[PDB]
Subunit: 92 residues, 2 copies
Amino acid sequence: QFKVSHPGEMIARDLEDMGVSGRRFAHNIGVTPATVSRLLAGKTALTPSLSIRIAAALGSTPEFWLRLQSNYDLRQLENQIDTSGIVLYGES
Amino acid sequence: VSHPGEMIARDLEDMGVSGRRFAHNIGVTPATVSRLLAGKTALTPSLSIRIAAALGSTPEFWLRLQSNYDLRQLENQIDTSGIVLYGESNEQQQ
Ligand SMILES: [K+]
Ligand SMILES: [K+]
Ligand SMILES: [K+]
Ligand SMILES: [K+]
Ligand SMILES: [K+]
């Protein structure tokens, strides 16, 4: 599996399973319902501040949530970055 | 906890590589590299792919250095005490 999920869609499923609305989740974590709506739709990133608030509501660590976002962003780049012409200066 | 740009700067210094030469190698503008090295802009996912190609390790590693930096500015700052952890036992203040 090359394509991986935006963390918003994992959150959306957890909220569905718990019977928790986007608005109620936003009020619990202390952000606007508009922010949550965009996050759940995968239209905005799970930022460092959001990761702290989300870990407090859904568990694990802020680092976990951020890692999911980073992983999504890398795979979304697809073929955009040709690395074949980049000379290795370090060690790999 | 240093910004990852300043870690890169030290590596470039050790290799005798200017910021401009590094920018040309990784395929971005010297302005972008200059801002990164000064800690004035974030190490993004696209940059992490290019940087991993030039300096080694994985894109995820460079992104983790950036995340660590960002979270160190905030984990001591944001009050989570009002946030319910769903499914946990109700809080009981003594
Ligand atoms: K995979
Ligand atoms: K479910
Ligand atoms: K409310
Ligand atoms: K942490
Ligand atoms: K280093």
